[PDB]
C-alpha cells in the first residue's frame, strides 16, 4: 500500500442565494468523493458504488441523524463568528478533518477551520491545542481549550478512529483505490518564436494522480525555467499532466515505482 487519506469537509453559508444550500458535508478517500449530505436532501448518501454496497442502511440512518445535529451547530457557530467580526451579508464557514496512512505505516491527523476561505483555527493533536490566526479565533480557542474531554476525544478520533475507517474503506474500494494505470508519455518539439524551440513532455491515462515529471540536460537537473501543467482529471478515472522547457535533453517521469526516460 502507498499513501492513502480520509477527509471530511463541512461548508456553511449564511443567507445563501436562490439554489445553494446553507450546509454541505462531503467525504473523500484520496481524490474520490465517498459520501454526501446537505441541508436540502437532509440525507447522508453514498457518492461511490463501493460505499453503497458495503455499508448497511443503519450506517446511513445513524449518520444522517448526526449530520442534522452538525448542520445546526454549524449555523450557530457562523452566527457567533459574524457577530465577533461585526459582519453582515453572506459569509462562509468551513471545516476539514482527516487522516493519512503513510507508505511506511506511520499516520497523520488534521482538524482545521476556515472563515471566508481563510485559515481560522488549526488543531495540534500533539500539544492538545488550537492555533488562532486573530483575536476572534483567540476568543473561540479559549472556549474550546476549556473542554479537556473534547480535546482528548478529538486526539483519539484522529489517531485511532479515523485510521480504522480509512483502512475499512480502502478494503471496500480496493479495485479502484489500489489500482495502477501507467502513463502514456510523449515528447513534442516545436520551433516557436523565430529563434527558440519549445519541448513538451505530456502524460495521460494515469492513475493514481501522483506523478513526478522533470527535464534533465546531460543527466543533471535543468537550471533553466521548467513550466508545469496541473495534474488534471480526464473524466474516466485517469489523469493528465505536462512539463515544458525552451532550448542532450531528456524527460524523466516517475509513477508508482516505475521510472521512464524520453531522450530527445
Amino acid at each position, epitope marked *: 500500500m502507498r499513501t492513502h487519506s480520509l477527509r471530511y469537509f463541512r461548508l456553511g453559508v449564511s443567507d445563501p442565494i436562490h439554489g445553494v444550500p446553507e450546509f454541505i458535508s462531503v467525504g473523500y478517500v484520496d481524490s474520490h468523493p465517498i459520501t454526501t449530505y446537505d441541508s436540502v436532501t437532509r440525507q447522508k448518501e453514498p457518492r461511490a458504488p463501493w460505499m453503497a454496497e458495503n455499508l448497511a442502511p443503519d450506517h446511513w440512518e445513524r449518520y444522517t*441523524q448526526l449530520l*442534522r*445535529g452538525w*448542520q445546526q451547530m454549524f449555523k450557530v457557530e457562523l452566527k457567533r463568528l459574524q457577530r465577533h467580526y461585526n459582519h453582515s451579508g453572506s459569509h462562509t464557514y468551513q471545516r476539514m478533518i482527516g487522516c493519512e496512512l503513510l507508505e511506511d505505516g506511520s499516520t497523520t491527523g488534521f482538524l482545521q477551520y476556515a472563515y471566508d476561505g481563510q485559515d481560522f483555527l488549526i488543531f495540534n493533536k500533539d500539544t492538545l491545542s488550537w492555533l488562532a490566526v486573530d483575536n476572534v479565533a483567540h476568543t473561540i480557542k479559549q472556549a474550546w481549550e476549556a473542554n479537556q*474531554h473534547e480535546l*482528548l476525544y478529538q*486526539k483519539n478520533w484522529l489517531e485511532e478512529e479515523c485510521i*480504522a475507517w480509512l483502512k475499512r474503506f480502502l478494503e471496500y474500494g480496493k479495485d479502484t483505490l489500489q489500482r495502477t494505470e501507467p502513463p502514456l508519455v510523449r515528447v513534442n518539439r516545436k520551433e516557436t518564436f523565430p529563434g527558440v524551440t519549445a519541448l513538451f513532455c505530456k502524460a495521460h491515462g494515469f492513475y493514481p494522480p501522483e506523478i513526478y515529471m522533470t527535464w534533465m540536460k546531460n543527466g543533471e537537473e535543468i537550471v533553466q525555467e521548467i513550466d508545469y501543467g496541473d495534474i488534471l482529471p480526464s473524466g474516466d478515472g485517469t489523469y493528465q499532466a505536462w512539463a515544458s522547457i525552451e532550448l542532450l535533453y531528456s524527460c524523466h517521469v516517475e509513477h508508482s515505482g516505475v521510472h521512464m526516460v524520453l531522450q530527445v
Partner: antibody
Amino acid sequence: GQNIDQPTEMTATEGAIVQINCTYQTSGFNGLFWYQQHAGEAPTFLSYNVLDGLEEKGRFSSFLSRSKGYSYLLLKELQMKDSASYLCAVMDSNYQLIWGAGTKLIIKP
Amino acid sequence: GITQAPTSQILAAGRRMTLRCTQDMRHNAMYWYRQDLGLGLRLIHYSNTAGTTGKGEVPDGYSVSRANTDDFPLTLASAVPSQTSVYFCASSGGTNNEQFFGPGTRLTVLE
C-alpha cells in the same frame, strides 16, 4: 458495538478498596463513561476516559486501556453512602452510547 | 435541569399515555431510555437537534416528537403490560458528551 461486561454484584467492607471491572467489545471506540445510580434515583456522571491512563477524582479513580478494551472504577476508603449501582457505558463508532447492565455494590459495615 | 411528568402512573392496557420531558440547559441532543431489572438502559428514541428524531434499540409501541429544543415528549399510543418500566429522559450538549438524566417515571401498565 455488541457487548459491555461488568459483574452483576460486588460486596466489600467499609474503609476498604473495591475495583469495578468493565470490558467492552465494540465496533469502534469514542469514550467510556462511568455513572453512579443510587437505588430509586437517576444515574449521575462519575467519569469519562478516551485515552489510556488513570484519572483520580477524590476517593474515585477511572482507568482505561484501549488495546485491552478494559476499564475499571476504583473506590477507596469505602463508605456506606457508596452502596449504589455503577454503570459502564461505551460510545461506539456511530456515536451510540452502549450501556452495561450495571454492578450493584454492597458495603459490609 | 431536567423535569419529567408524570413521575408515577398506573395505566389500564390499551390506553394512550404521554410522558413529558423538559430541559433548561439548551442541550441539542435528547434521549428516552427504559430501565428494567437485569438489563441496562435501553434506548427507545433519540433526537440530535430540534426538528429530527431517530429510533433507538427498542422503538416499538412508542413515538416521539421534537418541535423545540426544550421538550421531547414520549407517546405510548396503546399501552401494553410489557411497557411497565422506569423511564428516564436524558440530554447532552453534543453527541460526543455526557448525559444528564431526568428523575425518572415509574409506569405500570395493567390489564
